[PDB]
Enzyme design. Structure first.
Site, PDB file in Angstrom:
ATOM      1  N   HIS A 141      29.961 -43.710 -23.737  1.00 10.67           N
ATOM      2  CA  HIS A 141      30.870 -44.229 -22.706  1.00 10.67           C
ATOM      3  C   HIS A 141      30.780 -45.735 -22.563  1.00 10.67           C
ATOM      4  O   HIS A 141      29.730 -46.326 -22.866  1.00 10.67           O
ATOM      5  CB  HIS A 141      30.590 -43.656 -21.318  1.00 10.67           C
ATOM      6  CG  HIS A 141      30.049 -42.260 -21.299  1.00 10.67           C
ATOM      7  ND1 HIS A 141      28.749 -41.973 -21.008  1.00 10.67           N
ATOM      8  CD2 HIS A 141      30.693 -41.110 -21.576  1.00 10.67           C
ATOM      9  CE1 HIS A 141      28.648 -40.641 -21.039  1.00 10.67           C
ATOM     10  NE2 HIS A 141      29.775 -40.099 -21.434  1.00 10.67           N
TER      11      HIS A 141
ATOM     12  N   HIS B 145      30.344 -48.346 -19.786  1.00 12.94           N
ATOM     13  CA  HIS B 145      29.813 -48.539 -18.432  1.00 12.94           C
ATOM     14  C   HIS B 145      30.372 -49.863 -17.870  1.00 12.94           C
ATOM     15  O   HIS B 145      30.735 -50.762 -18.665  1.00 12.94           O
ATOM     16  CB  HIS B 145      28.281 -48.416 -18.371  1.00 12.94           C
ATOM     17  CG  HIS B 145      27.808 -47.022 -18.607  1.00 12.94           C
ATOM     18  ND1 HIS B 145      27.005 -46.394 -17.718  1.00 12.94           N
ATOM     19  CD2 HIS B 145      28.055 -46.184 -19.632  1.00 12.94           C
ATOM     20  CE1 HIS B 145      26.713 -45.191 -18.220  1.00 12.94           C
ATOM     21  NE2 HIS B 145      27.347 -45.000 -19.365  1.00 12.94           N
TER      22      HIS B 145
ATOM     23  N   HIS C 299      29.956 -45.267 -15.267  1.00 12.94           N
ATOM     24  CA  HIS C 299      31.073 -45.297 -16.216  1.00 12.94           C
ATOM     25  C   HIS C 299      32.187 -46.180 -15.641  1.00 12.94           C
ATOM     26  O   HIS C 299      32.461 -46.159 -14.460  1.00 12.94           O
ATOM     27  CB  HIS C 299      31.610 -43.921 -16.524  1.00 12.94           C
ATOM     28  CG  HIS C 299      30.580 -42.981 -17.047  1.00 12.94           C
ATOM     29  ND1 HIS C 299      30.927 -41.702 -17.414  1.00 12.94           N
ATOM     30  CD2 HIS C 299      29.264 -43.137 -17.350  1.00 12.94           C
ATOM     31  CE1 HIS C 299      29.836 -41.077 -17.850  1.00 12.94           C
ATOM     32  NE2 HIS C 299      28.811 -41.924 -17.801  1.00 12.94           N
TER      33      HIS C 299
ATOM     34  N   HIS D 155      34.876 -37.796 -13.732  1.00  9.41           N
ATOM     35  CA  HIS D 155      34.505 -37.826 -15.158  1.00  9.41           C
ATOM     36  C   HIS D 155      35.305 -36.786 -15.914  1.00  9.41           C
ATOM     37  O   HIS D 155      35.499 -35.631 -15.374  1.00  9.41           O
ATOM     38  CB  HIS D 155      33.007 -37.587 -15.338  1.00  9.41           C
ATOM     39  CG  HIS D 155      32.566 -37.601 -16.759  1.00  9.41           C
ATOM     40  ND1 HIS D 155      32.345 -38.784 -17.486  1.00  9.41           N
ATOM     41  CD2 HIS D 155      32.278 -36.610 -17.611  1.00  9.41           C
ATOM     42  CE1 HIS D 155      32.010 -38.470 -18.729  1.00  9.41           C
ATOM     43  NE2 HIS D 155      31.929 -37.125 -18.824  1.00  9.41           N
TER      44      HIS D 155
ATOM     45  N   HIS E 140      37.370 -41.059 -16.378  1.00 11.41           N
ATOM     46  CA  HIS E 140      37.081 -42.495 -16.244  1.00 11.41           C
ATOM     47  C   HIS E 140      37.686 -43.210 -17.440  1.00 11.41           C
ATOM     48  O   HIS E 140      37.722 -42.671 -18.549  1.00 11.41           O
ATOM     49  CB  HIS E 140      35.569 -42.655 -16.288  1.00 11.41           C
ATOM     50  CG  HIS E 140      34.865 -41.930 -15.196  1.00 11.41           C
ATOM     51  ND1 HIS E 140      33.633 -41.318 -15.399  1.00 11.41           N
ATOM     52  CD2 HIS E 140      35.186 -41.694 -13.908  1.00 11.41           C
ATOM     53  CE1 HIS E 140      33.179 -40.897 -14.240  1.00 11.41           C
ATOM     54  NE2 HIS E 140      34.142 -41.055 -13.302  1.00 11.41           N
TER      55      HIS E 140
ATOM     56  N   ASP F 217      35.404 -43.053 -20.560  1.00  9.42           N
ATOM     57  CA  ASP F 217      34.974 -41.734 -21.096  1.00  9.42           C
ATOM     58  C   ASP F 217      35.431 -41.536 -22.526  1.00  9.42           C
ATOM     59  O   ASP F 217      36.580 -41.140 -22.780  1.00  9.42           O
ATOM     60  CB  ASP F 217      35.500 -40.638 -20.185  1.00  9.42           C
ATOM     61  CG  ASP F 217      34.802 -40.586 -18.857  1.00  9.42           C
ATOM     62  OD1 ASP F 217      33.723 -41.231 -18.616  1.00  9.42           O
ATOM     63  OD2 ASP F 217      35.263 -39.884 -17.944  1.00  9.42           O
TER      64      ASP F 217
ATOM     65  N   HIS G 187      23.930 -41.665 -25.180  1.00 13.02           N
ATOM     66  CA  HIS G 187      23.101 -40.831 -24.278  1.00 13.02           C
ATOM     67  C   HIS G 187      22.223 -39.827 -25.046  1.00 13.02           C
ATOM     68  O   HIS G 187      22.515 -39.461 -26.181  1.00 13.02           O
ATOM     69  CB  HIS G 187      23.987 -40.099 -23.277  1.00 13.02           C
ATOM     70  CG  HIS G 187      24.544 -40.966 -22.186  1.00 13.02           C
ATOM     71  ND1 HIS G 187      23.906 -41.186 -21.015  1.00 13.02           N
ATOM     72  CD2 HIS G 187      25.669 -41.715 -22.166  1.00 13.02           C
ATOM     73  CE1 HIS G 187      24.615 -42.035 -20.264  1.00 13.02           C
ATOM     74  NE2 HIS G 187      25.744 -42.316 -20.932  1.00 13.02           N
TER      75      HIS G 187
ATOM     76  N   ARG H  97      19.972 -42.833 -20.944  1.00  9.55           N
ATOM     77  CA  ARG H  97      20.649 -43.864 -21.757  1.00  9.55           C
ATOM     78  C   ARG H  97      19.716 -44.305 -22.877  1.00  9.55           C
ATOM     79  O   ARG H  97      18.701 -44.957 -22.586  1.00  9.55           O
ATOM     80  CB  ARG H  97      20.996 -45.015 -20.834  1.00  9.55           C
ATOM     81  CG  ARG H  97      21.793 -44.606 -19.614  1.00  9.55           C
ATOM     82  CD  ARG H  97      22.191 -45.740 -18.698  1.00  9.55           C
ATOM     83  NE  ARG H  97      22.883 -45.214 -17.536  1.00  9.55           N
ATOM     84  CZ  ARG H  97      23.638 -45.902 -16.678  1.00  9.55           C
ATOM     85  NH1 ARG H  97      23.768 -47.216 -16.788  1.00  9.55           N
ATOM     86  NH2 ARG H  97      24.260 -45.286 -15.696  1.00  9.55           N
TER      87      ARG H  97
HETATM   88 CU   LIG Z   1      27.437 -43.306 -20.393  1.00 12.33          CU
HETATM   89 ZN   LIG Z   2      32.699 -40.779 -17.087  1.00 17.64          ZN
END
Ligand SMILES: [Cu+2]
Ligand SMILES: [Zn+2]
Ligand SMILES: [Cu+2]
Ligand SMILES: [Zn+2]
Lengths: 153, 153
Positions: free
Chosen positions: B46, B48, B63, B71, B80, B83, B120, B143
């Protein structure tokens, strides 16, 4: 209205630092922070064009220069947008960064978001060295540490 | 008309990678690159909100979500902006990133320039899990590595 950014400087050697930026609307950018691990004295400090760390600081490219000018000090009319002059390290290798600049921005065509901050091995001669390299880099030499400039809360 | 970006991912552990981005006009953003050091399986991926590495990946914030949605996966209406779903590593720990996305951008209000890419620990459940966490993170867990998205040549 108020925009903030941040830059973590890293390199292959001991030099590291954290730079903060703030701009209110179309006002000056206020640059602050601390760099450690430097030799005592003046070190060139510029925004470079690309936020590209794939080859360490080399892949950041040249000074940020959207008005296609020669290199200068931050007070010069003839300068690159990225030309923020010298930071000064004391006896302990610490530079306290305190700069206000009117050419860089955190939005629009002069934005430094997503570009690179670099601190150099040597003093930036502010374009006054009388060789061609002065008119490009100020003879500031190698890039000791750099970081991509990101959007901050 | 053509924008390019790049992101070097680093963390505390062995995960590293290089992500490339290209957007031609208002075509979609084409995302490519390689991530190494991953466990076999799917890993959430994603944008951020903050390009802030002062506290490793933690300081990147949540995000990127300028439309204040829940999400989702990249194909979901409710997602998001940041995403981008999952990347997959085989037995060698290598993910080959290949994504096309029309909600992220490299300019304008949906620009990801100066924000952070995160890869992730776990699979992103695409916001389909039956809990509050799914609606925030996809249950993607820790993360592993991140970097600030920079302007590329
Ligand atoms: Cu993320
Ligand atoms: Zn998200
Ligand atoms: Cu420089
Ligand atoms: Zn310059």
């Amino acid at each position: 209205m108020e925009m903030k950014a941040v830059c973590v400087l890293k390199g292959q050697g001991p030099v590291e630092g954290t730079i903060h930026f703030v701009q209110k609307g179309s006002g000056p950018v206020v640059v602050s922070g601390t760099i450690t691990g430097l030799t005592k004295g003046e070190h060139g400090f510029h925004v470079h064009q690309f936020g590209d760390n794939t080859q360490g600081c080399t892949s950041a490219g040249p000074h940020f220069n959207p008005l296609s000018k020669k290199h200068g000090g931050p007070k010069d009319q003839e300068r690159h947008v990225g030309d923020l002059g010298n930071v000064t390290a004391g006896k302990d290798g610490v530079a306290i960064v305190s700069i206000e600049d009117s050419l860089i921005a955190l939005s629009g065509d002069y934005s430094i978001i997503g570009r690179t901050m670099v601190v150099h091995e040597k003093r930036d001669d502010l374009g006054k060295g009388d060789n061609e390299e002065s008119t490009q880099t100020g003879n500031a030499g190698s890039r000791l540490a750099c970081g991509v400039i990101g959007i901050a809360q």
